[PDB]
Design a binder for this molecule. Structure first.
Ligand SMILES: Nc1ncnc2c1ncn2[C@@H]1O[C@H](COP(=O)(O)OP(=O)(O)OP(O)(O)=S)[C@@H](O)[C@H]1O
Ligand SMILES: [Mg+2]
Ligand SMILES: [Mg+2]
Length: 347
């Protein structure tokens, strides 16, 4: 029952896995803090509310085709070098919320330093709390890092705030759970992961969500560690979450950022967070996308098809510093849906 001090005193601060403020980039907002246990259970399913509103991320692809809900839990699935951390930075930059909580689990110390430098550059400095653990820490503290980030998010949610929590990565948190379980007598069950791991991923992953007070919307990064190897964890985490964003290294090599493969992504809350007009426009654009990709890798029909493909790829491509209001995103959605209605038809 390890506890830690959380609250307004950690705003604009960097916390080590035990809640010690090791750095600030903002004068302390206020000296208000509770003691809280960092590993508690999710709230009762019957105390939840529905994922109603959308969360406007300012990213066109997400807000248009994969709209997130306030209280949703979303995964960011990618192999190496596809831009998970950069997508996190863009989401922090362009999303509107009261508090942003980031949990860096088991990265190099220099990566922690680079993230904190980016955090210092931003205009939302006073709204952010970073909790970190490097690979040099024991696995216990790597688990405590994510648990503590979740606890900070929960504090500010109980204050009635819209919180956005990030965990980079859930792959490393799962491996740290595995190592702590193994190094205490527990036996492996599936791909060397002890059984308790599978009971302890949702325990953490089901803590975010909306309540009668405020809300926590959560993004978790998952590594697609190699083909045809061990990925029981990627699939299990996919199971636990309310959707996922897949980043293809195909698009990443082109420089098409964010490297979101829309056809491989889904927001399982899209139906209840979007208007019916938006929903049918999004279905039209998804039909158009899949119809175009059916051709891609194979006269004037093909001219129109591929120039439309270029237009769509350009509309999806968007730099980190660039922000798109929901209105602008929706009008672009309407235009491409129009392009599905009046279509060239090469078959
Ligand atoms: N959206 C983006 N915009 C611009 N460059 C990007 C973007 N995403 C990735 N990059 C490039 O990729 C580099 C690092 O990408 P990352 O965001 O770290 O991907 P990653 O999957 O998080 O890597 P890991 O954590 O080591 S597996 C950046 O320094 C850029 O050169
Ligand atoms: Mg990363
Ligand atoms: Mg695995």
């Amino acid at each position: 029952a390890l506890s830690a001090w959380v609250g307004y005193s950690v705003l604009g601060a960097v916390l080590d896995p035990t809640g010690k403020i090791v750095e600030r980039f903002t004068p302390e907002v206020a000296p208000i803090s509770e003691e809280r246990v960092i590993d508690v259970a999710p709230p009762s399913y019957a105390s939840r509310v529905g994922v109603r509103e959308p969360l406007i991320t300012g990213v066109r692809a997400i807000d248009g085709l994969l709209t997130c809900g306030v209280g949703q839990r979303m995964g960011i699935f990618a192999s190496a070098g596809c831009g998970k951390t950069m997508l996190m930075h863009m989401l922090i930059e362009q999303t509107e919320a009261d508090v942003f909580v980031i949990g860096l689990i088991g990265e190099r110390g220099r990566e922690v330093t680079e993230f904190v430098d980016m955090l210092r550059a931003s205009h939302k400095k006073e709204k952010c709390v970073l909790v970190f653990a490097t690979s040099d820490f024991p696995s216990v503290d790597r688990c405590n890092a994510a648990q503590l980030a979740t606890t900070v998010a929960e504090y500010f949610r109980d204050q009635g705030k819209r919180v956005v929590l990030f965990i980079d990565s859930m792959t490393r948190y799962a491996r740290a759970l595995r190592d702590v379980a193994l190094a205490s007598g527990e036996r492996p069950a599936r791909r060397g992961y002890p059984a308790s791991v599978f009971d302890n991923l949702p325990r953490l992953l089901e803590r975010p969500g909306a309540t009668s007070e405020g809300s926590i919307t959560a993004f978790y990064t998952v590594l697609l560690e190699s083909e045809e190897e061990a990925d029981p964890m990627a699939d299990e985490i996919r199971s636990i979450l309310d959707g996922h964003l897949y980043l293809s290294r195909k698009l990443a090599g082109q420089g098409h950022y964010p490297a979101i493969d829309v056809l491989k992504s889904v927001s399982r809350v899209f139906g209840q967070v979007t208007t019916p007009t938006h929903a049918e426009q999004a279905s039209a654009v998804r039909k158009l996308m899949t119809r175009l990709e059916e051709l891609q890798l194979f006269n004037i029909d093909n001219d129109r098809a591929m120039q439309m493909r270029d237009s769509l790829k350009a509309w999806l491509c968007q730099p980190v510093a660039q922000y798109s209001s929901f209105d602008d995103t929706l009008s672009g959605m309407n235009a491409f849906a129009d392009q599905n209605s009046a279509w060239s038809h090469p078959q």
